């Protein structure tokens, strides 16, 4: 496989890890759920619901590369899984893969029976202007078919993040959340769009809502860290990153995946003049930082 499965895989033992993964999306954490879906993928790689679930989980878990690898499996096994195309559009946008992002948005739209006949229609992003135009036009055409479709607006928000048209992006993502205000991904998307469009305060209000809805949303925690750091609110940035770190490990390859976050943390500890805390980051134990930054629930 092309996916770096965790070696010491306790869910490889269990009876129904697919059921347990779905359960753990609601009742536990992303990391544990991804480990359970990893088990199913390993034992039964023809199950594209397993790959799909692994991929979706990993993106929320701040692991787009692993999300893409998983989602490409799901894509092969079921070229018509709408949600797989959507997640690929999002992760490829994050990864600055413009051709793949536009291909995934086009696939997203045309895999839907309600929009599939757009595939046969005759219809500033200068690095792929026809690919871009085609997607933009297809999504507009879909909006005329379906004007208050929340996911069309969200998908235009993605398209518009890819081309740095953050105002249009925000306006579409805003409408999306107005339609679906309990959707935590939509709030995050609106937040990320606002932050990158240099509106960090509004962004932080959007992120807060998203985390309220889904308190294990590690990507949101990271994003908040980023905005707080950007506004030079290092106490708040540091708290968010300890939470993210804590959630992201619920061990082995997973230990390694947290290292870049730890280094980002180390910078916040440096800038705030805490060389004593900086020294402690090299051990990679959260406990000292849970105490230091007021997250004492993590000591239970």
């Amino acid at each position: 496989t092309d996916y770096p499965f965790e070696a010491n895989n306790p869910y490889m033992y269990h009876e129904n890890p697919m059921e347990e993964g779905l359960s753990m999306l609601k009742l536990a954490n992303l990391a544990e759920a991804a480990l359970a879906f990893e088990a199913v993928c390993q034992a039964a790689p023809e199950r594209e619901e397993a790959w799909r679930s692994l991929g979706l989980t990993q993106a929320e878990n701040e692991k787009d590369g692993l999300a893409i690898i998983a989602l490409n499996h799901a894509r092969m096994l079921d070229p018509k899984d709408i949600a797989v195309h959507a997640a690929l559009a999002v992760s490829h946008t994050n990864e600055h893969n413009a051709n793949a992002a536009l291909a995934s948005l086009r696939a997203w739209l045309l895999s839907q029976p309600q929009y599939e006949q757009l595939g046969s229609v005759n219809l500033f992003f200068f690095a792929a202007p026809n690919e871009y135009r085609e997607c933009r036009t297809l999504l507009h055409a879909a909006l005329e078919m379906n004007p208050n479709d929340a996911q069309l607006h969200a998908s235009l928000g993605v398209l518009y993040n890819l081309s740095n048209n953050y105002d249009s992006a925000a306006a579409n993502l805003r409408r999306a959340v107005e339609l679906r205000p309990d959707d935590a991904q939509l709030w995050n998307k609106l937040g990320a769009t606002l932050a990158n469009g240099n509106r960090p305060q509004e962004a932080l209000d959007a992120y807060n809502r998203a985390l309220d809805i889904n308190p294990g949303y590690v990507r949101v925690m990271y994003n908040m860290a980023v905005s707080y750091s950007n506004m030079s609110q290092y106490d708040l940035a540091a708290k968010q990153l300890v939470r993210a770190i804590y959630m992201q490990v619920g061990g082995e390859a997973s230990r390694e995946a947290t290292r870049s976050m730890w280094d980002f943390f180390r910078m916040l500890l440096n800038v705030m003049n805490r060389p004593d805390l900086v020294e402690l980051t090299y051990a990679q134990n959260v406990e000292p930082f849970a105490k230091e930054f007021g997250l004492q629930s993590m000591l239970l």
Partner: peptide, 5 residues
């Protein structure tokens, strides 16, 4: 650092 969708 970029925000992630």
């Amino acid at each position: 650092r970029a925000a992630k969708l």
